A paper describes a structure:
Mutant variants of MNEI were designed with the QVVAG segment engineered into loop2 and loop3 (L2MN and L3MN, respectively). Domain swapping in L3MN is expected to produce a swapped dimer with the C-terminal β strands (β5) exchanged between the two polypeptide chains. SEC profiles of both L2MN and L3MN showed two well-separated peaks, corresponding to the hydrodynamic volumes of the monomer and the dimer. The dimer to monomer ratio was roughly 60:40 for L2MN, and 30:70 for L3MN. The structure of the L3MN monomer was solved by X-ray crystallography and was found to be similar to the wt MNEI structure apart from minor differences in the fold of loop3. The predicted torsion angles indicated that loop3 adopted a β-strand conformation in the L3MN dimer, in contrast to being a β-turn in the L3MN monomer. However, the SAXS profile of the L3MN dimer fit better to the loop3 domain-swapped dimer model structure (χ = 2.2), than to the dimer observed in the crystal structure (χ = 4.6). Finally, similar to L2MN, the QVVAG to QVNAG mutation in loop3 of L3MN (L3MN*) led to the disappearance of the observed dimer. Altogether, the SEC, MALS, NMR and SAXS data indicate that L3MN forms a dimer by domain swapping, wherein loop3 acts as the hinge loop. For MNEI, we observed an inverse correlation between the length of the loop into which the QVVAG motif was introduced (e.g., loop1 in L1MN (1 residue long) < loop2 in L2MN (2 residues long) < loop3 in L3MN (6 residues long); calculated using) and the extent of observed dimerization in the resultant variant (dimer population: L1MN > L2MN > L3MN).
Author numbering: 2 to 97
Write the structure that this text describes.
């Protein structure tokens, strides 16, 4: 895995909306209203450990406000677009 911080622009905010949408299906935290994704947002790029030295997927680690509480959500993304999954959604957590 390799790590980088990405901005919290539209792509990142939409990851946050996805996370909230998916958590609403579960219902652990009742019915949440997405507010906004705040810094820092981390992107993990996952590589196959042997040649051809290749990317097998991504994971995003977000701090997202929903219904005015702060949550940590981890989201996986496949190489073939449109395979996103909510891995973890935990909180409330203290601010970064």
């Amino acid at each position: 895995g390799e790590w980088e911080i990405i901005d919290i622009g539209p792509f990142t905010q939409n990851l946050g909306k996805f996370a909230v949408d998916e958590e609403n299906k579960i219902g652990q935290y009742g019915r949440l209203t997405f507010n906004k994704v705040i810094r820092p947002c981390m992107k993990k790029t996952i590589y196959e450990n042997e040649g051809f030295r290749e990317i097998k997927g991504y994971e995003y680690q977000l701090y997202v406000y929903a219904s005015d509480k702060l949550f940590r959500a981890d989201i996986s993304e496949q190489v073939v677009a449109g395979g996103r999954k909510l891995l973890r959604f935990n909180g409330p957590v203290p601010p970064p």
